[PDB]
Amino acid sequence: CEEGLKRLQQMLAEYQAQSDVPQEVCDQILEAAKESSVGEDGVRSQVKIRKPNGKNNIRYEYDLITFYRHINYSD
Amino acid sequence: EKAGDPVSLVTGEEILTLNDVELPNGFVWSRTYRSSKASRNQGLGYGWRHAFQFELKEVTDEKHNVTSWTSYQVYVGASCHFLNPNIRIVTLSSGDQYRFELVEDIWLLKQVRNGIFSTFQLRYSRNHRLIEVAHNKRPVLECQYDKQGRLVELLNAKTEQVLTTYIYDEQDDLVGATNDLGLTERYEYQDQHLIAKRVRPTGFTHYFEWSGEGSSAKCIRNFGDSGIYDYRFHYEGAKSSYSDSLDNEWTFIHDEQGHLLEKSSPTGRTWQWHYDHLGRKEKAVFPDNSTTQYQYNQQGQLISKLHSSGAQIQYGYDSLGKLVKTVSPDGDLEKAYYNSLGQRVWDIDALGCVTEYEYDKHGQVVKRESEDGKKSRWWWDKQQRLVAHEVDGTLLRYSYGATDLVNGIAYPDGCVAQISYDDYGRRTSIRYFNDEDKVGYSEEYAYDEFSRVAQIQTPEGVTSYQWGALAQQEAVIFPDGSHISYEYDQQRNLTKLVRSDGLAFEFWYDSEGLLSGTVGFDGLHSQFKYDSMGRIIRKDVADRTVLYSYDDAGFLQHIKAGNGKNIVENHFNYTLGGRLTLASNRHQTLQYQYSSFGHLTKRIQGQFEIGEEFNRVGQRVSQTLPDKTSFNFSYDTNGRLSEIRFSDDSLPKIEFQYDVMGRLSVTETESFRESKLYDGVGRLVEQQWSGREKKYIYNAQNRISSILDNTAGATHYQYDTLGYVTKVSEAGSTSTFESDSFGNPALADSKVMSDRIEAYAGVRYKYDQQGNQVKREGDGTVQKRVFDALSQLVEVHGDSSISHYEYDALGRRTKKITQNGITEFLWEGERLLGERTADGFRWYLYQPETYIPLAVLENGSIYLYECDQVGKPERLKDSAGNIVWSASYDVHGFASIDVEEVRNPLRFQGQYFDQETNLHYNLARYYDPKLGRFIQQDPISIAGGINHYQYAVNPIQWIDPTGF
């Protein structure tokens, strides 16, 4: 279960979305749809918008382990 | 373990951990319970440690005695080495990248490193009690006893104010917490120093029951206040079992040492682990037929990990360092460099672009250098706070308020943002300023009596949240006045979602806790069958089925989709670790080819081949295209596309220039130039094309209110409190609309059952059990469409014209058959690349990061586009500067073509307009410009919005590419 406190960051993250569904249900919904979210694996795209993505705003936003780089696998 | 709310599985010990203060610097002050061995008193009560009091009983023989609870130790990794004898330096240095340096003659520990940038310094008083805690050098914390050796208050040593107020009782144990936030949590124990009940500050009380007596008791029947968490534990020998409030029993079997050997599931899934007598896992057995074998060399380090019917990772270390080389059993392999100071540098991944790091006399990073730009610069003051940060040439500025919280942010364009703070954290207001005296886009946040967000005020409205005393978002109130409520069940699972209209979305869960059925507002049903590993196998839609099938490796292999007619039968071939490269169906067989190091240098789409070349820095240059035409792409500093050249000498080049913020600012050619100008917030307000000027004027609600055009254009829009378009006036007339605050027409010529419309503007539509529009009868025109089993249009007729569509194995349209002929399309990933209409090859060029078209090549000629801030093509002109294509779109998005010298099927964003059906198909769906809504539902209906047929709030400031 989940008993921790929801800070302002998580509230602002779920506020800017458009689903109004918790993450545990949204992830299950996205996992239940595999035939529509299929894409090329290992192909660098230059569209910055994936298939599981969708509606977005035209306004620009530049709001502000964080020093190194996960190479492939950090067990 | 920790299966119970906070209880163990190998034993009945109850362990609970809470944090008292959470400073923005990174200081953490926690405390554990440790029900086992709760007879001693360390100054914080019977069996209570503040997680900052370490104690080595003797010089080396005795245990370190962690707060949670050479003579090398292979099982745990201890490396306690003595030092100079007078001042007894020990420096435990266990295998958990810690270092507990203790000193004799004073009995205290200091220099607790937790990485490279995490340190702690202690300072005790004349007695054996700590009185000062510091991060690196400056005073941070301060204790205050009550002349009995019991901690009560905790000061900040910079501002006189209590942080945590412990409240004890007549039994020498705390019964109150009073933490930093100001939430008092009560605890009542038994007569043997065993916890009995714990009352949360919100009002939820947990209870505990013990079976045994003393320190060897077992905690069973851990129930809540109203049966929300009804956990029943049962221990017998070396096997334990526990069941939650949903009658789901999970069993575990351990060994004598205490490691996990076997784990069972109420469905039948079993996990097994076999060790190699040295405390390291050797064999792992999953519920499915697959065994993972670990192989270790001297000192272990997990040098080999082989999976059944697969490959191995083969980690690498030189003598004692971190990961030095990663094999990556695919065509690539990567490496790094590690000296005996940390600061990993010279990381060579699959491609080039090595990563160099330059530091200062301290341990923080200063400069991060890569190939072809991508340089990161950081500036540090006398303290550890960041001052200047440059990622791509911005050089932002940060100003503090004599505290550890950011107060002001300065941009290189003059925009200054100021943040206000109260006596606590949880910032409540943020404002943005400019070079002039004005206010814009200011957000406020107000909290309730607890530490939860109560309401948020935005220039658009006010959104409120009401909790059910458990922090689960019981209800949400919109600025308009409507409310959305949630109803949960045992174990806090989402069950019902109700809104103001009256319809309710329902969910169902199986014995494993996964989603096993959804009932929508209009009325649907699902099963969501899963295998013994947690992967969807059968969708089991009320009318159709998908029938996934894997290849016992973790990737999808086959899709036998079909509801009795028009079977799909999609096939794929995944390799070890991705690299699909193959997708076959009855219509298209997409194939791909990779290089040695790994690069999509050759793609095959039926009978067409594209091909492309990569550079040393991984950038794609000299792009190859069929019919023997090639492009040339150049770059510059910071790694951005600024020059595009063609293989034909009779074609001009395009030059791009960015602003100080990193956005596309100017695009120019030999006979064309486009300039864009913002207002300082991030919204386009002015556009110039050297002969055409467009301006945008916003209202107080941050919405496009007026659009002024030089060529006889002045359009005005007025919206409602939510944002839906209420009225629009272009030149002489005002068109008005209405809605029910949910995306449905509420005029006198509307009719909806639950969410779908039945009649609009005298046009009737028919829906089937799946929810798609199969029949459309207007004012004398009947249109009948037949779809596939994957919610995609197959054929359309009824208007004295037959049209058929054929897609690939990825859902992209490949063939379109109609009365005009056969049209073949060429896709590049998720964006349309070109098309063939048996009369030549057309190539569509778009922006490097967006879907805005710029130029189109046809018959050795190039035509430049002119679009607005939305991204829809408005004008198209040749190289001579004459009007070749010009049209005007309405509020709904209907094309009114005036000059039709050349055909232009482009639309808002990546969509394709059909001449025979008047529909916009972008990637997987169809949009009707004469209606304003889609004709079919998407599989992201509940995770993409409330209304399933709604495109957007308003097509003036919102886009929706890639279909759903």
Short mmCIF file of C-alpha atoms in Angstrom, two decimals, chain A residues 6 22 24, chain B residues 471-475 485-496:
data_model
loop_
_atom_site.label_atom_id
_atom_site.label_comp_id
_atom_site.label_asym_id
_atom_site.label_seq_id
_atom_site.Cartn_x
_atom_site.Cartn_y
_atom_site.Cartn_z
CA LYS A 6 2.04 13.73 -0.86
CA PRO A 22 -3.65 7.59 -9.91
CA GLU A 24 -1.07 2.64 -10.14
CA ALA B 471 -4.61 11.21 1.95
CA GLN B 472 -6.27 9.41 -0.96
CA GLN B 473 -7.83 12.31 -2.94
CA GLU B 474 -11.42 11.59 -1.97
CA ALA B 475 -12.86 14.42 -4.07
CA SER B 485 -15.39 11.71 -6.23
CA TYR B 486 -13.54 8.44 -5.67
CA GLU B 487 -14.82 5.41 -3.75
CA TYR B 488 -12.26 2.85 -2.60
CA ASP B 489 -12.39 -0.59 -0.99
CA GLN B 490 -10.29 -2.70 1.38
CA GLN B 491 -6.50 -2.31 1.10
CA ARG B 492 -7.10 1.13 -0.49
CA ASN B 493 -7.86 0.09 -4.07
CA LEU B 494 -9.62 2.36 -6.55
CA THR B 495 -13.12 0.96 -7.15
CA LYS B 496 -15.56 3.67 -8.30
#
